[PDB]
Copies of this chain bind each other. A is one copy, B any other.
């Protein structure tokens, strides 16, 4: 059945719609109700205790209550190997949508800068998870060995500098940079930030959130900017807003790290 009798009873009066598998390997179901939407997010036991495990996402959502705008945890359970999280819908409009037609590079970059600022204001002394590079790399070793890592187009392309996934891993292992831990979203992108009245209104997709180096989220922003918006001058703009000098070695490193995840 995958969900418990209790959870089924909770979600009964909602119309269930499978999401487009945007959060694969997690299964996401939109639950359309009369007065609101709920989201049910599920991950199987192969992902237990990794940064994909929604139990992990649930823990961070509870800890983040009162520190960052996040959906409310409504129900959580382990059932028949599955981790099942039922949550409220984020407030505001999804970034990718808010700026869908907005050819405004300036606004998403401004939004990225605000997120980084918000993150650095969060006290991580009691943060439930530490996603230091030793932890991420141990996890990556495990995913690789159990054929759960995300091997695809970026390992097969002729243009790849590494002959295979394990070559990229060894590089990540030996070139590990020094780290200064701060709160980190883990997968910061326009598909999981919500905005409302020009202000950040919510974050979702928090399974990879916790302590990590400050250049990790920054690196993701640089990658977003370059992928969408095409011009490198918007990268320089991003760093003027942050008011810091980019560390390209670290930025390159974190972008490579995400390839297998």
Contacts and interface: CB of A to CB of B under 8 A. Distances in A.
Contacts of A3: 156
A12 B158 contact: yes
Given A21-B20, A165-B1, A8 B156 contact: yes
A151 B13 contact: no
Contact of A153 (B16, B153, B156): B16
A153 B12 contact: no
Contacts of A15: 157
Interface of A: 1-3, 8, 11-13, 15-18, 20-21, 24, 27, 29, 44, 80-81, 147, 151-153, 155-158, 164-165
Given A21-B20, A21-B24, A24-B21, A2 B151 contact: yes
Nearest to A155: B1
A47 to B, nearest CB: 13
Given A1-B165, A29-B152, A164-B1, A147 B44 contact: yes
Contacts of A20: 20-21
